[PDB]
Amino acid sequence: IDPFEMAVKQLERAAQYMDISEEALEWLKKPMRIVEVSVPIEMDDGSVKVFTGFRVQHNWARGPTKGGIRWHPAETLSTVKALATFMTWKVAVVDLPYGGGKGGIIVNPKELSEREQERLARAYIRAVYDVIGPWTDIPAPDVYTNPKIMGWMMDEYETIMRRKGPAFGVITGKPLSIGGSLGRGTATAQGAIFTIREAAKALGIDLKGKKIAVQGYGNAGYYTAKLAKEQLGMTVVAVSDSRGGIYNPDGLDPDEVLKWKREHGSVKDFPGATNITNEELLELEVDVLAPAAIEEVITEKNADNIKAKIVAEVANGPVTPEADDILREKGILQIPDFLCNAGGVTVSYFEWVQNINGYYWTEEEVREKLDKKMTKAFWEVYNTHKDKNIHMRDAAYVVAVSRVYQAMKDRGWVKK
Ligand SMILES: NC(=O)C1=CN([C@@H]2O[C@H](COP(=O)(O)OP(=O)(O)OC[C@H]3O[C@@H](n4cnc5c(N)ncnc54)[C@H](OP(=O)(O)O)[C@@H]3O)[C@@H](O)[C@H]2O)C=CC1
């Protein structure tokens, strides 16, 4: 069904546990500004192709909107709106002076060359210039966008802006040479590790030697497993990808599995590990389960089979609303997705702060600040969950929507 409708339904279902006026709810149920533009580029054959670009700013009560740009053939304005709405709550829950934004281009980037990709990024910046800026809207990498495209976009924005202000802060996730930030590549996994470590403290479980199963082995999942092994002292016993999964009760080495995957395409048939499927990985007896591949992997048809103490929603929306109640019934602590993977946007905020301040931090300072922020956010959400006797997802919504609502009231946008 429609992604924006599902996001609105999640907001409405959460709103029953908080005291928010109906006018504020109606304000929050629709994006404040939506921009749809034509993005023309000159192809390598000389023809001019026009692409459809999107730029959604859901709410900027707490500050400039924040959100990445995704390049995808199945990209829809409804998906952009839903993701911007979720970005609002994600920045609100970790207490950032940000609002929620999202961008997208309907394009198959695999059919474009390097020059065509650079032209597409520059044309997108030239088209959405009037609604973005260091204090207006800060994009970032997302699906099929990378630091290289971010650098191209930053250069185009600086050329248009005539270097009048800090042009580095218009976009995050850029290379370290042009105002990048240390700790960006492991941001999401590091934040997820911090939240898992705090959840173990909440449940009174010592993680030094426990089992973790990670679904997905991209930038997020592989680093989640690596940091869980080295920082949390855990034993990775199962990793998977779009092809299949592997299992090893003794433990798996994330670096070796990554090297094997880079060579044979997938992680399957890893030396000394049972082969499994993606569905069997979720139902494996582990202490922490971290789905980080796609959305809606845990539904009402397989939630009774989850036997992990902690479910770390590293991916976006990997658990259906109907499965939340089933998981909570069995006694499983779940870390909501827009809280578990907020480390990426937190480090993006740190990069933006460094850009607008003209002063850049070291790796240790970035990691320490991220640890403080993630620990505080998790404990706020968990205390709200415990006091109000509601689901962790509902508690995170209560925390984020309350902040956005208070900002809206203080601005005078809503009088009630
Ligand atoms: N910055 C980040 O990393 C952030 C991550 N997230 C979420 O985490 C998820 C993954 O992030 P990221 O690592 O960047 O993504 P990548 O595209 O880098 O990797 C995704 C991984 O998922 C695997 N996968 C794809 N489809 C399936 C499937 N049907 N079953 C099992 N595994 C599958 C892929 O395997 P294969 O290699 O074979 O394709 C790949 O290993 C996304 O949902 C994303 O929104 C959340 C916020 C930010």
mmCIF file of all heavy atoms in Angstrom, residues 109-154:
data_model
loop_
_atom_site.group_PDB
_atom_site.id
_atom_site.type_symbol
_atom_site.label_atom_id
_atom_site.label_comp_id
_atom_site.label_asym_id
_atom_site.label_seq_id
_atom_site.Cartn_x
_atom_site.Cartn_y
_atom_site.Cartn_z
ATOM 1 N N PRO A 109 20.467 4.666 -12.186
ATOM 2 C CA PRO A 109 21.851 5.157 -12.257
ATOM 3 C C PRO A 109 22.828 4.178 -12.885
ATOM 4 O O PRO A 109 23.912 4.603 -13.301
ATOM 5 C CB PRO A 109 22.206 5.427 -10.788
ATOM 6 C CG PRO A 109 21.301 4.536 -10.015
ATOM 7 C CD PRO A 109 20.026 4.442 -10.799
ATOM 8 N N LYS A 110 22.487 2.893 -12.967
ATOM 9 C CA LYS A 110 23.379 1.918 -13.577
ATOM 10 C C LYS A 110 23.501 2.097 -15.085
ATOM 11 O O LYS A 110 24.518 1.702 -15.663
ATOM 12 C CB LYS A 110 22.902 0.499 -13.261
ATOM 13 C CG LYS A 110 22.959 0.148 -11.784
ATOM 14 C CD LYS A 110 22.176 -1.119 -11.485
ATOM 15 C CE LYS A 110 23.023 -2.131 -10.731
ATOM 16 N NZ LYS A 110 23.449 -1.622 -9.398
ATOM 17 N N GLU A 111 22.498 2.687 -15.732
ATOM 18 C CA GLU A 111 22.537 2.948 -17.164
ATOM 19 C C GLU A 111 23.204 4.272 -17.511
ATOM 20 O O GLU A 111 23.355 4.581 -18.695
ATOM 21 C CB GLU A 111 21.120 2.918 -17.746
ATOM 22 C CG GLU A 111 20.458 1.554 -17.694
ATOM 23 C CD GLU A 111 21.142 0.542 -18.593
ATOM 24 O OE1 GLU A 111 21.680 0.944 -19.645
ATOM 25 O OE2 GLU A 111 21.144 -0.658 -18.245
ATOM 26 N N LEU A 112 23.600 5.058 -16.515
ATOM 27 C CA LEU A 112 24.262 6.336 -16.742
ATOM 28 C C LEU A 112 25.762 6.194 -16.526
ATOM 29 O O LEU A 112 26.207 5.473 -15.628
ATOM 30 C CB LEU A 112 23.708 7.417 -15.812
ATOM 31 C CG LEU A 112 22.278 7.898 -16.056
ATOM 32 C CD1 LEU A 112 21.946 9.043 -15.115
ATOM 33 C CD2 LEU A 112 22.084 8.313 -17.504
ATOM 34 N N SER A 113 26.535 6.885 -17.354
ATOM 35 C CA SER A 113 27.978 6.927 -17.207
ATOM 36 C C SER A 113 28.371 7.903 -16.100
ATOM 37 O O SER A 113 27.530 8.559 -15.484
ATOM 38 C CB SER A 113 28.635 7.315 -18.531
ATOM 39 O OG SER A 113 28.315 8.649 -18.887
ATOM 40 N N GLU A 114 29.678 7.985 -15.846
ATOM 41 C CA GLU A 114 30.182 8.903 -14.828
ATOM 42 C C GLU A 114 29.856 10.351 -15.181
ATOM 43 O O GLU A 114 29.401 11.125 -14.331
ATOM 44 C CB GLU A 114 31.689 8.707 -14.666
ATOM 45 C CG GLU A 114 32.360 9.681 -13.713
ATOM 46 C CD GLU A 114 32.363 9.194 -12.282
ATOM 47 O OE1 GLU A 114 31.591 8.265 -11.960
ATOM 48 O OE2 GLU A 114 33.146 9.737 -11.475
ATOM 49 N N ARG A 115 30.080 10.730 -16.442
ATOM 50 C CA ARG A 115 29.777 12.089 -16.878
ATOM 51 C C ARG A 115 28.283 12.373 -16.817
ATOM 52 O O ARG A 115 27.868 13.462 -16.401
ATOM 53 C CB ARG A 115 30.314 12.317 -18.292
ATOM 54 C CG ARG A 115 31.804 12.034 -18.459
ATOM 55 C CD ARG A 115 32.683 13.185 -17.958
ATOM 56 N NE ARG A 115 32.572 13.411 -16.521
ATOM 57 C CZ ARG A 115 33.205 12.703 -15.597
ATOM 58 N NH1 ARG A 115 34.024 11.715 -15.921
ATOM 59 N NH2 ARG A 115 33.009 12.989 -14.313
ATOM 60 N N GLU A 116 27.458 11.409 -17.225
ATOM 61 C CA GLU A 116 26.012 11.594 -17.141
ATOM 62 C C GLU A 116 25.557 11.711 -15.691
ATOM 63 O O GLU A 116 24.666 12.503 -15.382
ATOM 64 C CB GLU A 116 25.291 10.449 -17.849
ATOM 65 C CG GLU A 116 25.184 10.647 -19.352
ATOM 66 C CD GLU A 116 24.957 9.352 -20.101
ATOM 67 O OE1 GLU A 116 24.889 8.288 -19.452
ATOM 68 O OE2 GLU A 116 24.850 9.396 -21.343
ATOM 69 N N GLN A 117 26.160 10.933 -14.792
ATOM 70 C CA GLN A 117 25.818 11.037 -13.377
ATOM 71 C C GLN A 117 26.191 12.404 -12.812
ATOM 72 O O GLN A 117 25.420 12.997 -12.047
ATOM 73 C CB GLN A 117 26.502 9.922 -12.590
ATOM 74 C CG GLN A 117 25.843 8.563 -12.752
ATOM 75 C CD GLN A 117 26.485 7.495 -11.896
ATOM 76 O OE1 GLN A 117 26.809 7.726 -10.733
ATOM 77 N NE2 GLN A 117 26.671 6.311 -12.468
ATOM 78 N N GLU A 118 27.371 12.917 -13.173
ATOM 79 C CA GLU A 118 27.757 14.249 -12.715
ATOM 80 C C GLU A 118 26.817 15.314 -13.265
ATOM 81 O O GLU A 118 26.426 16.244 -12.545
ATOM 82 C CB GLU A 118 29.201 14.553 -13.113
ATOM 83 C CG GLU A 118 29.739 15.829 -12.489
ATOM 84 C CD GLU A 118 31.135 16.176 -12.953
ATOM 85 O OE1 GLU A 118 31.831 15.284 -13.477
ATOM 86 O OE2 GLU A 118 31.540 17.344 -12.788
ATOM 87 N N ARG A 119 26.442 15.192 -14.540
ATOM 88 C CA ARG A 119 25.484 16.122 -15.123
ATOM 89 C C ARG A 119 24.144 16.056 -14.406
ATOM 90 O O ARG A 119 23.510 17.088 -14.173
ATOM 91 C CB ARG A 119 25.311 15.832 -16.613
ATOM 92 C CG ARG A 119 26.471 16.284 -17.477
ATOM 93 C CD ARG A 119 26.199 16.007 -18.940
ATOM 94 N NE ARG A 119 27.428 15.802 -19.696
ATOM 95 C CZ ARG A 119 27.674 14.743 -20.454
ATOM 96 N NH1 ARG A 119 26.796 13.762 -20.578
ATOM 97 N NH2 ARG A 119 28.831 14.666 -21.104
ATOM 98 N N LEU A 120 23.696 14.849 -14.050
ATOM 99 C CA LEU A 120 22.432 14.698 -13.338
ATOM 100 C C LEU A 120 22.484 15.352 -11.964
ATOM 101 O O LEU A 120 21.544 16.048 -11.568
ATOM 102 C CB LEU A 120 22.070 13.218 -13.219
ATOM 103 C CG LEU A 120 20.690 12.904 -12.637
ATOM 104 C CD1 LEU A 120 19.592 13.362 -13.582
ATOM 105 C CD2 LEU A 120 20.554 11.422 -12.330
ATOM 106 N N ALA A 121 23.577 15.146 -11.226
ATOM 107 C CA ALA A 121 23.709 15.785 -9.919
ATOM 108 C C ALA A 121 23.719 17.305 -10.033
ATOM 109 O O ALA A 121 23.017 17.996 -9.276
ATOM 110 C CB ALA A 121 24.979 15.296 -9.222
ATOM 111 N N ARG A 122 24.485 17.842 -10.987
ATOM 112 C CA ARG A 122 24.555 19.287 -11.155
ATOM 113 C C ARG A 122 23.217 19.871 -11.597
ATOM 114 O O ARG A 122 22.827 20.950 -11.134
ATOM 115 C CB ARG A 122 25.661 19.639 -12.149
ATOM 116 C CG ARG A 122 27.043 19.576 -11.534
ATOM 117 C CD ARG A 122 28.141 19.816 -12.552
ATOM 118 N NE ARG A 122 29.441 19.417 -12.031
ATOM 119 C CZ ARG A 122 30.150 20.119 -11.160
ATOM 120 N NH1 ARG A 122 29.734 21.293 -10.716
ATOM 121 N NH2 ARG A 122 31.308 19.633 -10.722
ATOM 122 N N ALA A 123 22.500 19.174 -12.481
ATOM 123 C CA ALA A 123 21.192 19.645 -12.920
ATOM 124 C C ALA A 123 20.180 19.602 -11.784
ATOM 125 O O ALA A 123 19.341 20.501 -11.658
ATOM 126 C CB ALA A 123 20.709 18.812 -14.105
ATOM 127 N N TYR A 124 20.233 18.563 -10.949
ATOM 128 C CA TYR A 124 19.356 18.517 -9.785
ATOM 129 C C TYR A 124 19.618 19.689 -8.851
ATOM 130 O O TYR A 124 18.669 20.302 -8.344
ATOM 131 C CB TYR A 124 19.530 17.192 -9.044
ATOM 132 C CG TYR A 124 18.667 17.058 -7.809
ATOM 133 C CD1 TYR A 124 17.345 16.648 -7.905
ATOM 134 C CD2 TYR A 124 19.175 17.341 -6.547
ATOM 135 C CE1 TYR A 124 16.555 16.521 -6.783
ATOM 136 C CE2 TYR A 124 18.392 17.221 -5.420
ATOM 137 C CZ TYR A 124 17.082 16.810 -5.544
ATOM 138 O OH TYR A 124 16.298 16.690 -4.422
ATOM 139 N N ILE A 125 20.890 20.015 -8.612
ATOM 140 C CA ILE A 125 21.196 21.182 -7.791
ATOM 141 C C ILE A 125 20.717 22.478 -8.431
ATOM 142 O O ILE A 125 20.133 23.320 -7.740
ATOM 143 C CB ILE A 125 22.700 21.262 -7.484
ATOM 144 C CG1 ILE A 125 23.093 20.127 -6.547
ATOM 145 C CG2 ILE A 125 23.058 22.605 -6.867
ATOM 146 C CD1 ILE A 125 22.353 20.135 -5.231
ATOM 147 N N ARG A 126 20.937 22.663 -9.731
ATOM 148 C CA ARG A 126 20.469 23.846 -10.436
ATOM 149 C C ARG A 126 18.951 23.963 -10.435
ATOM 150 O O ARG A 126 18.425 25.077 -10.507
ATOM 151 C CB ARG A 126 20.992 23.852 -11.874
ATOM 152 C CG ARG A 126 22.474 24.141 -11.986
ATOM 153 C CD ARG A 126 23.086 23.469 -13.201
ATOM 154 N NE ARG A 126 22.793 24.184 -14.437
ATOM 155 C CZ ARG A 126 23.549 25.154 -14.935
ATOM 156 N NH1 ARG A 126 24.636 25.572 -14.308
ATOM 157 N NH2 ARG A 126 23.207 25.716 -16.089
ATOM 158 N N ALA A 127 18.237 22.842 -10.355
ATOM 159 C CA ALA A 127 16.784 22.858 -10.317
ATOM 160 C C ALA A 127 16.192 23.062 -8.930
ATOM 161 O O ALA A 127 15.135 23.691 -8.826
ATOM 162 C CB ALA A 127 16.216 21.558 -10.907
ATOM 163 N N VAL A 128 16.830 22.564 -7.871
ATOM 164 C CA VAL A 128 16.232 22.658 -6.539
ATOM 165 C C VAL A 128 16.960 23.679 -5.673
ATOM 166 O O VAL A 128 16.802 23.688 -4.449
ATOM 167 C CB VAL A 128 16.198 21.281 -5.843
ATOM 168 C CG1 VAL A 128 15.550 20.245 -6.747
ATOM 169 C CG2 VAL A 128 17.599 20.842 -5.424
ATOM 170 N N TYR A 129 17.735 24.562 -6.299
ATOM 171 C CA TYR A 129 18.561 25.525 -5.578
ATOM 172 C C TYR A 129 17.768 26.445 -4.659
ATOM 173 O O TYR A 129 18.224 26.718 -3.544
ATOM 174 C CB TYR A 129 19.365 26.383 -6.565
ATOM 175 C CG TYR A 129 20.245 27.424 -5.901
ATOM 176 C CD1 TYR A 129 21.531 27.108 -5.482
ATOM 177 C CD2 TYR A 129 19.788 28.719 -5.687
ATOM 178 C CE1 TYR A 129 22.336 28.052 -4.875
ATOM 179 C CE2 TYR A 129 20.585 29.665 -5.075
ATOM 180 C CZ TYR A 129 21.858 29.325 -4.671
ATOM 181 O OH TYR A 129 22.659 30.263 -4.066
ATOM 182 N N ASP A 130 16.604 26.929 -5.089
ATOM 183 C CA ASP A 130 15.868 27.957 -4.367
ATOM 184 C C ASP A 130 15.209 27.439 -3.090
ATOM 185 O O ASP A 130 14.695 28.239 -2.303
ATOM 186 C CB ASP A 130 14.820 28.589 -5.283
ATOM 187 C CG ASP A 130 15.434 29.224 -6.515
ATOM 188 O OD1 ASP A 130 16.192 30.204 -6.365
ATOM 189 O OD2 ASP A 130 15.159 28.745 -7.632
ATOM 190 N N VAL A 131 15.213 26.126 -2.865
ATOM 191 C CA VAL A 131 14.540 25.565 -1.697
ATOM 192 C C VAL A 131 15.517 24.794 -0.820
ATOM 193 O O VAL A 131 15.107 24.118 0.130
ATOM 194 C CB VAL A 131 13.358 24.671 -2.117
ATOM 195 C CG1 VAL A 131 12.319 25.483 -2.875
ATOM 196 C CG2 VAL A 131 13.841 23.494 -2.947
ATOM 197 N N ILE A 132 16.811 24.890 -1.117
ATOM 198 C CA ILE A 132 17.841 24.232 -0.323
ATOM 199 C C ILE A 132 18.890 25.264 0.076
ATOM 200 O O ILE A 132 19.001 26.336 -0.514
ATOM 201 C CB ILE A 132 18.496 23.045 -1.059
ATOM 202 C CG1 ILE A 132 19.339 23.535 -2.238
ATOM 203 C CG2 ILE A 132 17.451 22.035 -1.504
ATOM 204 C CD1 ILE A 132 20.380 22.540 -2.686
ATOM 205 N N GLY A 133 19.658 24.921 1.106
ATOM 206 C CA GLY A 133 20.713 25.772 1.596
ATOM 207 C C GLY A 133 21.248 25.301 2.932
ATOM 208 O O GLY A 133 20.664 24.432 3.585
ATOM 209 N N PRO A 134 22.375 25.872 3.364
ATOM 210 C CA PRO A 134 22.965 25.452 4.647
ATOM 211 C C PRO A 134 22.044 25.651 5.838
ATOM 212 O O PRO A 134 22.159 24.913 6.822
ATOM 213 C CB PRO A 134 24.222 26.324 4.756
ATOM 214 C CG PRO A 134 24.535 26.717 3.355
ATOM 215 C CD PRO A 134 23.220 26.853 2.663
ATOM 216 N N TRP A 135 21.142 26.630 5.790
ATOM 217 C CA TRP A 135 20.189 26.863 6.869
ATOM 218 C C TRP A 135 18.757 26.578 6.436
ATOM 219 O O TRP A 135 17.817 26.880 7.177
ATOM 220 C CB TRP A 135 20.320 28.293 7.394
ATOM 221 C CG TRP A 135 21.602 28.523 8.126
ATOM 222 C CD1 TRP A 135 22.731 29.102 7.636
ATOM 223 C CD2 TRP A 135 21.894 28.154 9.480
ATOM 224 N NE1 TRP A 135 23.707 29.127 8.600
ATOM 225 C CE2 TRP A 135 23.218 28.550 9.743
ATOM 226 C CE3 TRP A 135 21.162 27.533 10.495
ATOM 227 C CZ2 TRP A 135 23.827 28.348 10.979
ATOM 228 C CZ3 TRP A 135 21.768 27.332 11.722
ATOM 229 C CH2 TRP A 135 23.086 27.737 11.953
ATOM 230 N N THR A 136 18.568 25.999 5.252
ATOM 231 C CA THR A 136 17.230 25.719 4.750
ATOM 232 C C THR A 136 16.974 24.221 4.663
ATOM 233 O O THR A 136 16.028 23.712 5.273
ATOM 234 C CB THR A 136 17.028 26.359 3.374
ATOM 235 O OG1 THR A 136 17.556 27.691 3.380
ATOM 236 C CG2 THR A 136 15.552 26.405 3.021
ATOM 237 N N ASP A 137 17.819 23.508 3.921
ATOM 238 C CA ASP A 137 17.627 22.091 3.637
ATOM 239 C C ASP A 137 18.968 21.484 3.257
ATOM 240 O O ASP A 137 19.590 21.915 2.280
ATOM 241 C CB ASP A 137 16.607 21.893 2.514
ATOM 242 C CG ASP A 137 16.127 20.460 2.401
ATOM 243 O OD1 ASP A 137 16.458 19.646 3.286
ATOM 244 O OD2 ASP A 137 15.414 20.147 1.428
ATOM 245 N N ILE A 138 19.409 20.489 4.020
ATOM 246 C CA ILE A 138 20.718 19.876 3.809
ATOM 247 C C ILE A 138 20.540 18.434 3.346
ATOM 248 O O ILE A 138 20.146 17.573 4.144
ATOM 249 C CB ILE A 138 21.579 19.934 5.082
ATOM 250 C CG1 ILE A 138 21.677 21.366 5.612
ATOM 251 C CG2 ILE A 138 22.969 19.386 4.814
ATOM 252 C CD1 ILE A 138 20.757 21.652 6.772
ATOM 253 N N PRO A 139 20.801 18.125 2.081
ATOM 254 C CA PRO A 139 20.730 16.740 1.610
ATOM 255 C C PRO A 139 21.927 15.918 2.086
ATOM 256 O O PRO A 139 22.824 16.403 2.772
ATOM 257 C CB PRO A 139 20.719 16.888 0.087
ATOM 258 C CG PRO A 139 20.289 18.291 -0.165
ATOM 259 C CD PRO A 139 20.847 19.080 0.964
ATOM 260 N N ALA A 140 21.918 14.642 1.700
ATOM 261 C CA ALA A 140 22.903 13.653 2.123
ATOM 262 C C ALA A 140 22.863 12.471 1.158
ATOM 263 O O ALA A 140 21.974 12.417 0.299
ATOM 264 C CB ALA A 140 22.619 13.210 3.560
ATOM 265 N N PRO A 141 23.800 11.529 1.227
ATOM 266 C CA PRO A 141 23.688 10.324 0.399
ATOM 267 C C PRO A 141 22.546 9.431 0.860
ATOM 268 O O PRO A 141 22.164 9.405 2.032
ATOM 269 C CB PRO A 141 25.038 9.621 0.593
ATOM 270 C CG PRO A 141 25.936 10.630 1.183
ATOM 271 C CD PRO A 141 25.074 11.559 1.966
ATOM 272 N N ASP A 142 21.994 8.693 -0.099
ATOM 273 C CA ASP A 142 20.992 7.677 0.195
ATOM 274 C C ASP A 142 21.137 6.615 -0.892
ATOM 275 O O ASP A 142 22.217 6.492 -1.475
ATOM 276 C CB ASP A 142 19.589 8.293 0.268
ATOM 277 C CG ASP A 142 18.530 7.300 0.733
ATOM 278 O OD1 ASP A 142 18.502 6.987 1.941
ATOM 279 O OD2 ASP A 142 17.731 6.831 -0.096
ATOM 280 N N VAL A 143 20.097 5.823 -1.140
ATOM 281 C CA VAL A 143 20.140 4.735 -2.118
ATOM 282 C C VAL A 143 20.717 5.233 -3.440
ATOM 283 O O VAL A 143 20.223 6.205 -4.021
ATOM 284 C CB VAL A 143 18.744 4.131 -2.326
ATOM 285 C CG1 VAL A 143 18.777 3.082 -3.422
ATOM 286 C CG2 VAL A 143 18.229 3.530 -1.028
ATOM 287 N N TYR A 144 21.776 4.565 -3.905
ATOM 288 C CA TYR A 144 22.413 4.818 -5.201
ATOM 289 C C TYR A 144 22.961 6.242 -5.305
ATOM 290 O O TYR A 144 23.127 6.793 -6.394
ATOM 291 C CB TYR A 144 21.459 4.511 -6.355
ATOM 292 C CG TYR A 144 21.134 3.042 -6.499
ATOM 293 C CD1 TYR A 144 19.894 2.625 -6.963
ATOM 294 C CD2 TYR A 144 22.066 2.069 -6.160
ATOM 295 C CE1 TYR A 144 19.594 1.284 -7.089
ATOM 296 C CE2 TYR A 144 21.772 0.725 -6.282
ATOM 297 C CZ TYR A 144 20.535 0.339 -6.747
ATOM 298 O OH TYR A 144 20.234 -0.995 -6.872
ATOM 299 N N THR A 145 23.253 6.837 -4.152
ATOM 300 C CA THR A 145 23.992 8.093 -4.122
ATOM 301 C C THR A 145 25.139 7.924 -3.139
ATOM 302 O O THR A 145 25.004 7.199 -2.149
ATOM 303 C CB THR A 145 23.100 9.283 -3.734
ATOM 304 O OG1 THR A 145 22.353 8.972 -2.553
ATOM 305 C CG2 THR A 145 22.143 9.616 -4.863
ATOM 306 N N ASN A 146 26.257 8.580 -3.419
ATOM 307 C CA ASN A 146 27.505 8.307 -2.719
ATOM 308 C C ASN A 146 28.236 9.615 -2.423
ATOM 309 O O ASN A 146 27.769 10.683 -2.838
ATOM 310 C CB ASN A 146 28.361 7.356 -3.562
ATOM 311 C CG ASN A 146 28.457 7.783 -5.012
ATOM 312 O OD1 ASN A 146 28.613 8.964 -5.316
ATOM 313 N ND2 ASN A 146 28.348 6.823 -5.917
ATOM 314 N N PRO A 147 29.359 9.585 -1.695
ATOM 315 C CA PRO A 147 30.117 10.831 -1.474
ATOM 316 C C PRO A 147 30.570 11.535 -2.745
ATOM 317 O O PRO A 147 30.709 12.762 -2.741
ATOM 318 C CB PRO A 147 31.310 10.353 -0.635
ATOM 319 C CG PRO A 147 30.772 9.212 0.129
ATOM 320 C CD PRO A 147 29.807 8.514 -0.785
ATOM 321 N N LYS A 148 30.818 10.795 -3.825
ATOM 322 C CA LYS A 148 31.232 11.413 -5.083
ATOM 323 C C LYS A 148 30.140 12.325 -5.641
ATOM 324 O O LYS A 148 30.398 13.477 -6.027
ATOM 325 C CB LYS A 148 31.596 10.311 -6.080
ATOM 326 C CG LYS A 148 32.010 10.779 -7.453
ATOM 327 C CD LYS A 148 32.055 9.601 -8.411
ATOM 328 C CE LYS A 148 30.724 8.863 -8.429
ATOM 329 N NZ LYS A 148 30.701 7.749 -9.414
ATOM 330 N N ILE A 149 28.904 11.824 -5.673
ATOM 331 C CA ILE A 149 27.775 12.634 -6.115
ATOM 332 C C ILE A 149 27.566 13.812 -5.170
ATOM 333 O O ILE A 149 27.216 14.916 -5.600
ATOM 334 C CB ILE A 149 26.516 11.760 -6.236
ATOM 335 C CG1 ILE A 149 26.715 10.688 -7.308
ATOM 336 C CG2 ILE A 149 25.300 12.604 -6.565
ATOM 337 C CD1 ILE A 149 25.765 9.522 -7.186
ATOM 338 N N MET A 150 27.782 13.594 -3.870
ATOM 339 C CA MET A 150 27.661 14.681 -2.905
ATOM 340 C C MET A 150 28.665 15.788 -3.196
ATOM 341 O O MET A 150 28.336 16.973 -3.104
ATOM 342 C CB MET A 150 27.859 14.150 -1.486
ATOM 343 C CG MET A 150 26.745 13.257 -0.958
ATOM 344 S SD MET A 150 25.057 13.811 -1.253
ATOM 345 C CE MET A 150 24.603 12.841 -2.689
ATOM 346 N N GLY A 151 29.900 15.415 -3.540
ATOM 347 C CA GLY A 151 30.894 16.416 -3.889
ATOM 348 C C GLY A 151 30.537 17.177 -5.150
ATOM 349 O O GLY A 151 30.710 18.397 -5.222
ATOM 350 N N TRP A 152 30.024 16.468 -6.158
ATOM 351 C CA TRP A 152 29.547 17.149 -7.362
ATOM 352 C C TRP A 152 28.446 18.155 -7.037
ATOM 353 O O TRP A 152 28.468 19.295 -7.522
ATOM 354 C CB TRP A 152 29.032 16.130 -8.372
ATOM 355 C CG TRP A 152 30.083 15.293 -9.004
ATOM 356 C CD1 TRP A 152 31.391 15.625 -9.200
ATOM 357 C CD2 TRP A 152 29.917 13.976 -9.538
ATOM 358 N NE1 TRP A 152 32.049 14.594 -9.821
ATOM 359 C CE2 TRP A 152 31.167 13.571 -10.039
ATOM 360 C CE3 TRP A 152 28.833 13.101 -9.636
ATOM 361 C CZ2 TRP A 152 31.362 12.329 -10.634
ATOM 362 C CZ3 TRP A 152 29.028 11.869 -10.230
ATOM 363 C CH2 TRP A 152 30.282 11.495 -10.721
ATOM 364 N N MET A 153 27.472 17.744 -6.221
ATOM 365 C CA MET A 153 26.362 18.622 -5.866
ATOM 366 C C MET A 153 26.840 19.828 -5.068
ATOM 367 O O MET A 153 26.371 20.951 -5.282
ATOM 368 C CB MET A 153 25.307 17.846 -5.079
ATOM 369 C CG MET A 153 24.460 16.914 -5.921
ATOM 370 S SD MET A 153 23.281 15.970 -4.944
ATOM 371 C CE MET A 153 22.576 14.913 -6.205
ATOM 372 N N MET A 154 27.768 19.610 -4.136
ATOM 373 C CA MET A 154 28.318 20.712 -3.357
ATOM 374 C C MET A 154 29.041 21.700 -4.262
ATOM 375 O O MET A 154 28.907 22.916 -4.103
ATOM 376 C CB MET A 154 29.246 20.158 -2.272
ATOM 377 C CG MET A 154 29.828 21.152 -1.256
ATOM 378 S SD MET A 154 30.947 22.433 -1.868
ATOM 379 C CE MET A 154 32.369 21.450 -2.327
#
